[PDB]
Symmetry: D2
Subunit: 244 residues, 4 copies
């Protein structure tokens, strides 16, 4: 077999925003490698992507796994020319109850992972004189939320990292951007009550929660030639929940 | 087709926006300051658009133009405020006329045209207002206090209006171009040296950003500034 | 008589924030000219300031009055070396009901006035190689409020103007800054209900409305030598209502 | 007197902050990475402060130092997180150690020390946490991705904590210095050319900003970044 499409890597593609991003990038014409934290989840991704992608197990907290996954992609499918850092979790707590592990795990899964994966894909993107690094941030990197000091610090750090890397890599036509979702309908919000979803949508100028596909549409735009002169920015997709 | 109105569509950014929105499937009314320019617009757009003369400083012309569009083509459901000029000067040499003309052509025009299209957009429960701003509304440039004030005002206006109209599914956004190629060689290099991507942009880059915002792919984006400056300024 | 103190001009000093600013600048050692829209209001200012200031009538919508007032100050008290643009009103309306006059009056009173007064005091500040221009903005130049498109546009324009002028005048050691108040207790908020003031304070991290003196303290800081390396900024004084 | 804790008070910005807070009426505990540096701090502060050795990378030392202050001087009611270093490199040459050390010394230290002082500030219904950031958290600089990420993270941390602690009248703010004179002549001119005020700043400018934020004159300011950069970067 042959693999002639440009390769996109989407971390945490099992569901919701990550799944929508991965499927959209497939529709756009990429060969998409998506990751999950378990081999079973990776196999589910393989099944969903069919012959235009692949699922791989990855814990983004571990440098050896990051390096092994990117090496596998390079050896089997091609250079990673679109990297979407989407994998994440939250470990919320007011600071007085935020443990060392609460802090470290979130910083490692979000910010350190962005540093490690971006560094690891630079050589191939430089070689191609083409690259897209698209980091999933959050509205709370801008509009502070009590109980999420770790998550907010990590996402804001990601945005500043992205500015630095955009400056370092711009001459090679590699763009580095962040997408900041607002209130997006996921399993989590599905689990909330109707009244609380209404409280949330009342804060949104467009008067509704967003959908994973809205984030996918933003990522797809940034990954395309239609955004070749956009780098070092935050693309806010929050329905007017936060305006800058 | 849905009707888009693009002011100052004669050349450069405006012309690229108008042509892209035609490609996207809109019927595009583009405007120029003269009947001759309007006719050239009509000729380029063919059966997918129309050219009209409009000085955006004049409220009567704004109302006549929008009424004409409503009577002949349909409600204005995409409004792109692109028309503009500069009258640069250090503040000590910036006259009342230099200030007022820039504020009127940019900010007042945005107020007047947005107000005039609200009714049709409200009826349709669909709308795109896309205002052309500038990097200098963020990264200040000596000699452009009037232009900078007007564009920043446009961005704040857009946030307020986005809040007012969001429930009706009308989005209001700004696109802020950086250094875009218009026409000065060693100086060009100075400009490109400030850009992370190490080159000047093209009108089509701005057209692509506007096309994105005007489409269903941006239906959950409102009240934002989309910077298209190659890393010249990073927010 | 003699007038040896540096001269500060505070527009709209009759009450609230402007009155607190004017009195604080007097306490700091300035000779303070404050303005009101009527001769009676100007006389009240003269009475409050005593022999360390003066009250003058000024409608900031009129260039001839601006030029006459600054000329009077220069001829009677000294060059305006601290300018605080505080005068203002609101004319709120959703855009569909916002008239041409609603728009124009607000833009003229806020933004055009800042342009005119700043331009008029530049020569004296340049001559002194010292200057402070301090523009009163608003949190709504950042956090959008429906019904205030004119006021928001004007204050945001003022902030951008201030950046431009800061760049133009920095070599002469003239600083140009804005102070953005949040919810400050004034006659207007006094006229609101207790329940609505509680609704407001609930949005504020510090859980209370501010006081005019908080704004005065910010202006006093920026006008002093303790802020000689601060220019082109917005100093937010809103108790955490809006964080940037 | 109320007790202020200033990390990295040996020289420059930290030393200026510590001396200014002494002048303001605080009892200042300043820290250094060695017992000798701590002794020099003790000597300079005299009867208005004390010097202690502290590596902010080590949680045990943080807890021992704050406990010692509580047992000997009083609750820490002003915390200034100033200690830091740089380990610059383009990302392709930035090692895991270069990244981790900077993140730990800046951001992790801010998390740990802020957490450790919350109880005393909550009891007093008074507190000032003032974190030293940098212009490069806003205006990116090649080679400083780690430093930039850490300082931006500190600013977002500060906003979150300001929301958590505001009801108790504890403010949490950042001060972002620009180009501040430390120690390279024609290059100095390049730096000053980027500054609207056309000169490098001094440590005392940063001390003045911190002194303002730590005082009653800033009791309604929380969750902000106070830029002190002479117009190098305008927000
Ligand atoms: N959800 C929302 O409403 C919002 C989300 N965001 C951000 O967008 C992204 C999407 O969030 P969400 O849609 O909630 O994604 P989900 O929480 O729905 O699923 C998260 C994904 O991350 C993966 N993941 C979790 N921990 C690790 C790890 N240690 N190593 C590798 N992969 C891991 C999971 O793998 P597995 O499937 O095996 O668990 C899963 O694929 C996140 O970065 C989040 O911060 C921002 C704003 C709003
Ligand atoms: N060009 C650039 O590099 C950058 C431009 N921008 C902004 O992008 C937009 C496009 O810039 P640019 O392409 O230079 O366009 P201009 O600002 O030069 O605008 C020219 C167009 O506007 C029309 N126009 C001028 N005055 C009026 C008026 N009073 N009423 C109606 N139409 C008027 C002209 O009509 P006619 O053809 O008849 O003269 C022409 O179609 C502007 O808002 C500009 O400020 C932002 C940053 C960079
Ligand atoms: N009040 C608040 O809570 C907030 C206020 N601000 C801003 O801070 C400033 C203070 O607002 P506020 O405290 O309400 O001041 P007030 O509304 O209490 O009084 C306003 C002052 O402005 C003067 N004024 C009004 N129109 C004119 C005019 N055309 N020419 C000259 N002077 C005029 C009045 O003069 P006279 O006394 O003769 O009427 C009065 O002195 C304003 O710029 C406002 O936008 C921002 C955020 C919150
Ligand atoms: N200096 C400048 O131009 C600018 C600096 N900044 C920031 O302002 C702050 C001050 O900068 P600068 O004056 O250069 O200070 P540094 O970043 O050089 O910090 C030096 C001080 O921190 C101490 N320190 C270093 N490592 C540790 C550690 N692991 N644990 C505890 N203390 C430590 C040093 O102790 P010892 O004396 O024992 O070595 C010394 O007191 C920093 O956060 C800096 O990043 C921001 C922008 C501009």
């Amino acid at each position: 077999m042959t693999q002639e499409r440009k390769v996109a890597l989407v971390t945490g593609a099992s569901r919701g925003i990550g799944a929508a991003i991965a499927q959209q990038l497939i529709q756009d014409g990429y060969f998409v490698v998506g990751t999950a934290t378990s081999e079973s989840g990776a196999q589910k991704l393989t099944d969903s992507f069919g012959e235009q992608g692949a699922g791989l197990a990855l814990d983004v907290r571990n440098l050896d796994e990051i390096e092994a996954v990117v090496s596998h992609i390079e050896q089997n499918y091609g250079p990673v020319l679109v990297l979407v850092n989407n994998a994440g979790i939250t470990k919320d707590n007011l600071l007085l109850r935020m443990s060392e592990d609460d802090w470290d795990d979130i910083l490692n899964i979000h910010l350190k992972a962005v540093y490690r994966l971006s560094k690891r894909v630079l050589k191939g993107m430089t070689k191609a004189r083409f690259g897209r690094i698209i980091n999933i941030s959050s509205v709370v990197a801008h509009f502070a939320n009590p109980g999420q000091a770790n998550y907010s610090a990590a996402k804001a750090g990601i945005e500043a990292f992205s500015r630095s890397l955009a400056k370092e890599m711009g001459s090679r036509q590699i763009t580095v951007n962040s997408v900041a979702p607002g209130f997006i309908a996921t399993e989590m919000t599905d689990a909330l009550s109707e009244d609380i979803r209404k409280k949330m949508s009342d804060q949104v100028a467009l008067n509704r929660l967003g959908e994973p596909q809205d984030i996918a549409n933003a990522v797809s735009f940034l990954a395309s030639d239609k955004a070749g002169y956009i780098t070092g920015t935050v693309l806010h997709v929050n329905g007017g929940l936060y305006m800058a």
